[PDB]
Amino acid sequence: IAIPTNFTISVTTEILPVSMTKTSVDCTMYICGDSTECSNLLLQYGSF
Amino acid sequence: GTITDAVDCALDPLSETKCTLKSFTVEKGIYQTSNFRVQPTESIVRFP
């Protein structure tokens, strides 16, 4: 049998992500460049 | 089958949130609404 006669205290770093950057996209302003006729056609696609 | 009340979606932010949630009663919380945009004051035409 093998039994240790000494010991070495060690510290190990562990990296874990908790969150990420939030994202808020204005779909009407993204797809349509503040155009009225573009928004009138975009509204026809439902509630996407 | 009769219209008992109506909500003007451009009178105040409360009615805008009501129209966004499609409910006359809005509970406590924060809700994202339509983004504000500065409309152009006049038109500028530049040609050769």
Swiss-Prot record, chain A:
Glycans are attached at residue 6. Precursor of the fusion protein processed in the biosynthesis of the S protein and the formation of virus particle. Mediates fusion of the virion and cellular membranes by functioning as a class I viral fusion protein. Contains two viral fusion peptides that are unmasked after cleavage. The S2/S2' cleavage occurs during virus entry at the cell membrane by host TMPRSS2 or during endocytosis by host CSTL. It comes from Severe acute respiratory syndrome coronavirus 2 (2019-nCoV). Disulfide bonds join 32-38. This is Spike protein S2.
